Structures are given as structure tokens and as C-alpha cells.
Amino acid sequence: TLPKRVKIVEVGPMDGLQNEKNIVSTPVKIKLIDMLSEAGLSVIETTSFVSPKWVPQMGDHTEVLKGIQKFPGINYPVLTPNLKGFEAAVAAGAKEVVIFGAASELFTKKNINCSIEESFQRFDAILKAAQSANISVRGYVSCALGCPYEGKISPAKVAEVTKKFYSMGCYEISLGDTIGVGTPGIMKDMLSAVMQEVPLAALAVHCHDTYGQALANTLMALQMGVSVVDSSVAGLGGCPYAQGASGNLATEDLVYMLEGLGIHTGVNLQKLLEAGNFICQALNRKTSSKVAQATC
Amino acid sequence: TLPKRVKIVEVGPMDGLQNEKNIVSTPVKIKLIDMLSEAGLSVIETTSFVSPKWVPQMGDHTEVLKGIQKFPGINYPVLTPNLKGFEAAVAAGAKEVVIFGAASELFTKKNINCSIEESFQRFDAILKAAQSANISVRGYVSCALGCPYEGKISPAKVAEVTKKFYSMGCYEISLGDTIGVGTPGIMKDMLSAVMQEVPLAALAVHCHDTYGQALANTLMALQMGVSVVDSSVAGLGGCPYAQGASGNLATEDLVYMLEGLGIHTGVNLQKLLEAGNFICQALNRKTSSKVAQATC
Secondary structure, eight states, X not given: OOOSBOEEEEOIIIIIHHTOSSOOOHHHHHHHHHHHHHHTOSEEOOEEOSOTTTOGGGTTHHHHHHHSOOOTTOBOOEEOSSHHHHHHHHHTTOSEEEOOEESOHHHHHHHSSSOHHHHHHHHHHHHHHHHHTTOEEEEEEETBTBBTXXXXXXXXXXXXXXXXXXXXXXXXXXXXXXXXXXXXXXXXXXXXXXXXHSOGGGEXXXXXXXXXXXXXXXXXXXXXXOOEEEEBTTSOOOOTTSSSOOOBOBHHXXXXXXXXXXXXXXXXXXXXXXXXXXXXXXHTOOXXXXXXXXXX | OOOSBOEEXXXXXXXXXXXXXXXXXXXXXXXXXXXXXXXXXXXXOOOBOOOXXXXXXXXXXXXXHHHSOOOTTOBOOEEOSSHHHHHHHHHTTOSEEEEEEESOHHHHHHTTSOOHHHHHHHHHHHHHHHXXXXXXXXXXXXXXXXXXXXXXXXXXXXXXXXXXXXXXXXXXXXXXESSOOOOHHHHHHHHXXXXXXXXXXXXXXXXXXXXXXXXXXXXXXXXXXXXXXEEBTTSOOOXXXXXXXXXXXXXXXXXXXXHHTTOBOOOOXXXXXXXXXXXXXXXTOOOOOHHHHHHO
């Protein structure tokens, strides 16, 4: 049951850059996002409102959100790891925020020292204010296809966390294969359990290509009815738990497949590539997009 | 559903090496092949008995075929473009040969001035001589998911050429996405037509990753029932009718996906990665395998 249209959620400026060695100037970030708007993306994760102490690449969050062109119809969600960060996002003009959890206790104890139920106490406070402030919230679940610490993750657990997020108010939850270890059957089992508890349209998948399974895992999710998928431009954002291995699924390669499938994205591939090439040069790296390599 | 087991046809030493910039000595080729046999591959395309004047990277075809270890139960098919090559292969001990055509008239004309019909006349003689000699013949249909000159290729046309190879005597035919422009719908349509005319067991798929669609296209074929797929060790072998992008699908990334699916391949991933790293250093190139890059 392939969807007729898919909403590609671009994470290059946030997830992509957050996971890059060399940092980039604020003006380069704004230009990247503007170019992405130019290419037609309907949603571009813009930045993260979190201390520069924890993640310095996102330190310019306030001015980035303020300086980017706000194209009609385009969404620019931002990450808000804690009540204060959310507080700052609203002030900076954010119309949508993003909270992130995980289906793994260990991974939670490493990423935020707290427990899983505890991280939900934190999230409840944000969703609450978010609801008063009239701010839509998107959830994110890490280790949905496996954890670097705990290893195998259960479809029931992923379904449980996704369920929690959805009932607290999240309008859409993105399931992420952070270490990119998932294969098709794993994806199908996970999505299948989740789909019992949470309606299909509120689901999204974020697959890493560390082991070259991102597009394949994405295809499987699409065949299961999922209509929103996350990706980063030139495949930006490597993996912390791997060597010099690739990171996110390259958005250009994803649009290529979707267009091949005759599936609507609304993205202009030629402009998408310009954006990809613009940032790779600024970063002084090589695009991870195959489409980009075969194209020029 | 999916097959319980897949026969991986390794083409690195043949299709891969031929399409690689630098060349490696005869002993290196022999060692690479021995390393693949040790890794568990059941079929390893070994070399091509073609004029050295035309494809010099395969010039050592006789000594290479004679010098590799012949592991029990393992097949070492070699390419024989014409009758002279076939006769040279037989005289050198070949037990299986491979012939190649295309589902594209323009592609055939620019690579042999003969139409698709005429190309089959040249194969007719080889097939007769092969039957008389008790030698197996695998067929290969390039540009099955598109052609660099004609563009889109009709499913029915691919079905027609494949049926021709089969009725002519080929026990198996590999359908190759020569330029890697394919997407799952295209793969599904082509296979659907081919299957009306040829039994499932006689089919194989060979997807290039020039556009990042190799594994996804391969997955679609597995979902259609195909149980044999061609791949190259470290994604060796670029694409001529393309740019500096990659070529073949990395066997390691294929095995990784198949293991995750719980599909038997009888291949030892760790030993396959050793083979990859070995030929890569001999070629002074970085592996195209994602599994390899993230495993070390």
C-alpha cells in the first residue's frame, strides 16, 4: 500500500550539521536552509535550542531561526531538549518544536542521565506549555531498530514509547534507526507493532545509512503505509558509534526513488542538488548522495 | 514472500575489475578469487575470455582461470563474448560460460553493430557448441531497467530477450540495471513481464548503485520471488556510460541485509570483508561497502 504522496522531512541543517566535525558560520546555515526552502521541502528541521556546552554546533539557534526566510506553507520545526530551550524557541518565533526520546533505557541514561519514565516527566512539562503557547510538537524515538548499548529493541517497547508521545499531544512521531543497523524485517515488525497503537498518518521514519540499509528500510516503511520520512541533504551527519561511516539517508537519493515511483514530493531535485553542493563545499566534504555523484 | 535462501553471484573479479581504473597483477586476481571461495560464495565470476586488444584488464584470463583453487561445489563461470573466446575458455577448463546481450537496440548497435536479433545468432553457435561439450551457459540482459541511449525500456521487450536466451539453452539469465537508473516500480514491472515467460528459478538480478537504488531494487526482486542476485565485493566496478559515481552493489551490504532478514546465503561476512579490504588496497581505493566502513 504505497502512499500517493510523501512528506520529506529535511534534517540536514539540524541533525546533519549537529553531527559534523567542522562547524559552520551562521550565515552559511541560513543560506543552506533558504536554498532548501528554494528546493521545495515542506519541512526543514532548522536548529536546536540547547546549550552550546552540550552541542556547540547549534549555538546560533536563536539567530538562525530568526534570520531564515519563512516561505509560505513551509514548516521550520526546532528541537527543544528541555523546558528552558522550549521557552527560548517560542520567544525566537518557533511555530513547531521537537522533543526526543528513545526506546532504550541505557541510551536514555547516556543521552540525558534520566530514566525513560523520567524523560516523560520532562516532556509532559513541555507539551503542557506547548499546548498553552499553541505550539505543535513532534516526537522522536531513538534506537527504534536497535540500540548501540542494549542491542535488540522490542517492537512492543517502541510501540509503547510512541504511544506515550502520541497521547501526551505529539501530532507526529518519528521512529529513528539511529545506528542504521535495521534491516527490512526488523522495520516491518517495529512498524507493525506501532501501527496497532498509533494511527498511520502520525508516523514517520528516520533511517541512517551506516550499513547501507536506509533506502531499503525506508522502502519497507513506505510499503507499510508510512507517508513521512526523514533524510538529510548530501547525506549529512555521520554516526558517533561508527568509524568514518556515512550518516543520514541522502534526501536527493530518496527523491530520486520516490520520483521513480511516481510519488509526489513537491521537491525540485535540481535545486536540491545545488543546496547539497553548497553545504558540502562550505564543510569542505564530499556529498554522500549517489544521485549527486552520478549527476555531476 | 521472500525466498528462504539466496544464491549470490559474485562478480567483483570480472565485472568489477574490468570497470576499475587501476589494474592488478595476475597473482592478486588469483588471491582475490581464492579469498572469495574461502568466504563461502557459491559462484564467483572469474574472468573474461575476450580479445586482449579490446579489454586488456582481462588479458590474463587463461592463467587466472587455471591458477585459482577450485573449491568443491563452487562455480567459476567466465565470460565468452564469441565462439573463439568460448573455445579458449573450454580449452582452459571452464565448466560454465556467460553470454551477454541487451534489451536495447541502440545499446546493441553501439556495442556490436548488430541488432538484438542478430546478437542472438552469435550466441546460437556458442550454445550449440556448449551443449555438445556439456558446458553450462548463463545469459545476461543489460539495460533491463533502462538504457543510456534509448531511455526507458519496455518490460515486454526484456521478457522477450530473456525468453530467447532461455529457450536457446541458458539455464539462468541475469537481468541487469546497467546504469542503475531503476526504481522499485520499474523493477517490479520488468520482472512481472519476464516471469510470465520464464520460470522464477531461472532468474537473477544485477543492480548497479550509481543512483543509490541497488539494494532497494534488489529487495523488490526478492519480494517478487527472485532467489539469485549478482553483487561485487567492495562495490568494485564503476559505470562507463555514467560519471565518477559508483557501479556494482557491494556484496557485503547485500549479505548484511540478507542476514538481517534471516535468509541463508552461506557466506561468512567477516571473511568477505577481508577479501574486500585486500583488493581495495591492491587497487589503492576506498571500499564502496557501507558495512566495511562502519565495521572498521
